[PDB]
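Recall from the previous chapter that SMILES is a line notation for molecules. Here it describes calcium ion.
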Amino acid sequence: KTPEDCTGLADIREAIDRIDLDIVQALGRRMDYVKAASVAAMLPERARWAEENGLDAPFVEGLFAQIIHWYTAEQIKYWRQTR
Amino acid sequence: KTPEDCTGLADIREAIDRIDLDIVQALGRRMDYVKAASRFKASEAAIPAPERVAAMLPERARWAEENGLDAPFVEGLFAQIIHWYTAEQIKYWRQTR
Ligand SMILES: [Ca+2]
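With both inputs in hand, we obtain:
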């Protein structure tokens, strides 16, 4: 259901669980690409997307700095593991 | 293109942009739901239900492990999301109710 058609917290939770799983799945696919490849330029882009989507840019930049650094460190681990 | 079908770094960097934009857009839709949920709360202090959050976190962590990702990191990431959205829900609840 849309946010407007939600009749209670149970409807809300159905939608939020789906969004959050979508996010985790996208993050999983994101790692496959990073592995296949084996911040200052990436964050302004993502801060713009945040604003465009009605979200606080600096919070969303915090989320992406966290992500990008994790995936960078994992790429380094993965490289050593596979060479 | 799939990761295997990618011919160089350019393909991968653009796919990552599209995935990252998908996540932002999903996070934008998530905020709409969180703000709509405020209608179903009798008080600012019931934002959030502590047992809801307590069951949400291991579930996302478990999803992470099932998708090739580190549970502690992804659980921490969702802790931050849920926490910030809680604050945003509270602002919205106060403004409207
Ligand atoms: Ca791009």
